[PDB]
Amino acid sequence: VAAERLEPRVEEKDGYWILKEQFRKGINPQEKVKIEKEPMKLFMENGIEELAKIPIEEIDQSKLTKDDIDVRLKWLGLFHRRKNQYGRFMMRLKLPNGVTTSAQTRYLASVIRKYGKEGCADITTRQNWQIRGVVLPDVPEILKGLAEVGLTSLQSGKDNVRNPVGNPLAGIDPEEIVDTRPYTNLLSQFITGNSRGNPAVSNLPRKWNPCVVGSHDLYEHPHINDLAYMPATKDGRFGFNLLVGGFFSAKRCDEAIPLDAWVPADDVVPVCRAILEAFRDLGFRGNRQKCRMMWLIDELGVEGFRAEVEKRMPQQQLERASPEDLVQKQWERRDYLGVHPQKQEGYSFIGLHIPVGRVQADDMDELARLADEYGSGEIRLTVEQNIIIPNIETSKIEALLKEPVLSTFSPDPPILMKGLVACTGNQFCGQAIIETKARSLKITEEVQRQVSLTKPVRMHWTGCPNTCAQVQVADIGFMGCLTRDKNGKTVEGADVFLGGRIGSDSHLGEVYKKAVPCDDLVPLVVDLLVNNFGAVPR
Ligand code: SRM
Numbered sequence: 001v002a003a004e005r006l007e008p009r010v011e012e013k014d015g016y017w018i019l020k021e022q023f024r025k026g027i028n029p030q031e032k033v034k035i036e037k038e039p040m041k042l043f044m045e046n047g048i049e050e051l052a053k054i055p056i057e058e059i060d061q062s063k064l065t066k067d068d069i070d071v072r073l074k075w076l077g078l079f080h081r082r083k084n085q086y087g088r089f090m091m092r093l094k095l096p097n098g099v100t101t102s103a104q105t106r107y108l109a110s111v112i113r114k115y116g117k118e119g120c121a122d123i124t125t126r127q128n129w130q131i132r133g134v135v136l137p138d139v140p141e142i143l144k145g146l147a148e149v150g151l152t153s154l155q156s157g158k159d160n161v162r163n164p165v166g167n168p169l170a171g172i173d174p175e176e177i178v179d180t181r182p183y184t185n186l187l188s189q190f191i192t193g194n195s196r197g198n199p200a201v202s203n204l205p206r207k208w209n210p211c212v213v214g215s216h217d218l219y220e221h222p223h224i225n226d227l228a229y230m231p232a233t234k235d236g237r238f239g240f241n242l243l244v245g246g247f248f249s250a251k252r253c254d255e256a257i258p259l260d261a262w263v264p265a266d267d268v269v270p271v272c273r274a275i276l277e278a279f280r281d282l283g284f285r286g287n288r289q290k291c292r293m294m295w296l297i298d299e300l301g302v303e304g305f306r307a308e309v310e311k312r313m314p315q316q317q318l319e320r321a322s323p324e325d326l327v328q329k330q331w332e333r334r335d336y337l338g339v340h341p342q343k344q345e346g347y348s349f350i351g352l353h354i355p356v357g358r359v360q361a362d363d364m365d366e367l368a369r370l371a372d373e374y375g376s377g378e379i380r381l382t383v384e385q386n387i388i389i390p391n392i393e394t395s396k397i398e399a400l401l402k403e404p405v406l407s408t409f410s411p412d413p414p415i416l417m418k419g420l421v422a423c424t425g426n427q428f429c430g431q432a433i434i435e436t437k438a439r440s441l442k443i444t445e446e447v448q449r450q451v452s453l454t455k456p457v458r459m460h461w462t463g464c465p466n467t468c469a470q471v472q473v474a475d476i477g478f479m480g481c482l483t484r485d486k487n488g489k490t491v492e493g494a495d496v497f498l499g500g501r502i503g504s505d506s507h508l509g510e511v512y513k514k515a516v517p518c519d520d521l522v523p524l525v526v527d528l529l530v531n532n533f534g535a536v537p538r
């Protein structure tokens, strides 16, 4: 690689970071959008206040404003549902480590409640909240209300650092390696500039996923993150080995690889900044399918990329990885659903199944009430789109198990439901080829009616090749497609994936059978479970 390739391609101008004029040739249309107007100005210069006053019909009449609502607003966590819910916006938070409070939960419920049939909420595969139904004129007031309850929505979509994922059992697990909350909190604060906005990291060539590992279970899926912090001692000090470049896309899926770098715990933020600066400065900004960080790592090689991170460190040093990390390879991933003792004697947590991650305002209020009455007002989200309520005195569990809402959000659903993960799908998402959430529940119910099993089989349903519900990690994965019935009629279908493994012995699954009509999946899945996962016909 020529030394010229290493010239930073962006420059700080008037508080924002912009592509230098010599590096603007051949860019994709998303880069053109960012050049035409800095997305962070919608928040940091209160551009949203004026935008929110313009009728959508008018907004749509010029490129600048249309790009504001369709692209730039994703820097404020607002996602126009142009195709499937025109003029309404999904809103996505920063929720490091999946931790929420009852007050935050009631606040979000109050927002969606206003929108009636256009409103609901969802837990995401990055243990995050999304709310739905938002109209533009309400945005200024929602931004205020979020701030008031201690939340931010900043930089949660498009070319930004996505939700910092941690251990759902952080601080409460007798077997934890290190509490991930301080680190995921610190990263989120760094990314969002303490909720004011951080333009130093908001003009990336592409999205970028971080996680901090604290569990032997690897609940955090470090193998599929752009940056994963693996806890490891080095020379008697606590810190993290660094894995880089994990990603999924329609074109390519790749597991994270070692940077061959270790940092002390206190250097979590400095090294996040260094990697992000390297990516921002040097990343390719052409074909959007070749813009994720791994593509830069392949072009420079890992050592060339590592050198780029090193020079952006303070003291310009980056220690080599420690030979062993703290994660035990001998580990059976633990079920967190149900009632489990905390490390704090006299206390339990409860994992509740949230069917396909979907909740209404009334459900949110009920979960908030349980957290206040039984817990400490805390609710934790998981990447399987479930919840954990921690800090329940164990003597209250008997009363808790009789709560009527636990029949809907169960601490002990059937085993196939425990592992079921499903993306938004075509109810709201404009990229979706099929309906996912309702369909996956129905198929799973019908499959479980036919077979009993003891293995915790994990089934993931995703509505298009963007694979937001990560079908490549599943025991059985279903990727939406259109296909044909026996009469050649168009029907919704799934490509069926097998071979995904999670935890330390991770592996990416691959298509096993293409184009299965969704109405034919039950018998296929019944047979797969009997033949490959030890299921027994009822
Ligand atoms: C909500 C969520 C799925 C879910 O039901 O849980 C989701 C939903 C969306 N994804 Fe995603 N992604 C979700 C996690 C993922 C992950 C999983 C993960 O992070 O571990 C992936 C694959 C992993 C990865 O990115 O490396 C992911 C891969 C994508 C892709 C393809 C990325 C690429 O390199 O090509 C896109 C399209 C894009 O970015 O260009 C996409 C685009 C989108 C959009 C914003 C598309 C569009 O605007 O409609 C979806 C919004 C639909 C909606 O209304 O909810 N989303 N998306 C997840 C929100 C996570 C969060 O809180 O931040």
Ligand code: SF4
Pocket (backbone or CB within 6 Å): 423, 424, 425, 426, 429, 430, 431, 432, 433, 462, 463, 464, 465, 466, 467, 468, 469
């Ligand atoms: S996988 Fe496709 S359908 Fe599902 S939320 Fe992501 S972009 Fe939408």
Ligand SMILES: [Cl-]
Pocket (backbone or CB within 6 Å): 074, 157, 158
């Ligand atoms: Cl996006």
Ligand SMILES: [Cl-]
Pocket (backbone or CB within 6 Å): 080, 081, 082, 083, 084, 429, 430, 431
């Ligand atoms: Cl759309």
Ligand SMILES: [K+]
Pocket (backbone or CB within 6 Å): 353, 354, 355, 356, 357, 384, 385, 386, 420, 421
């Ligand atoms: K779930």
